[PDB]
Amino acid sequence: QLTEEQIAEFKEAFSLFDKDGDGTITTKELGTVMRSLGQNPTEAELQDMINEVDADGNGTIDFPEFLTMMARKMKDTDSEEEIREAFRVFDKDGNGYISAAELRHVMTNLGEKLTDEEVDEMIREADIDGDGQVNYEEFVQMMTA
């Protein structure tokens, strides 16, 4: 049961995958976004992910299919485990901290190229201890908010 607000957010997410703007997500487009953030799914794995969401079996995900799967499968909140996995992806050297560079890396690959001041403001919003980086607990707060 999605609100206008949620639809707008999902449209933006769908659009990142749908890089050619044709209103469908292919295996290729899904693979591209995944690899761009450090995932290494095999082709068969990608194909399964598509087939899972592709209700009409025509081989691509369209927006109605995407929204329907969101309404059927999404959680109310980001789960604890999803937050731990996402922290891993941001903290790609595994040093325990998300740095401005690691944050910029993720944001650019989510289709948002930010200035240094904007990256720094993002960090500032999360940065409880004022050290200039986002640790695990600070990241949890930003994800549960």
């Binding site: 953030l37 992910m49 992806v89």
Partner: peptide
């Protein structure tokens, strides 16, 4: 804001790139 976009991408079932 920008954090919201991360929240949305993290909570995508099936195809989230953050698994």
């Amino acid at each position: 804001n920008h954090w919201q976009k991360i929240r949305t991408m993290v909570n995508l079932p099936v195809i989230s790139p953050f698994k």
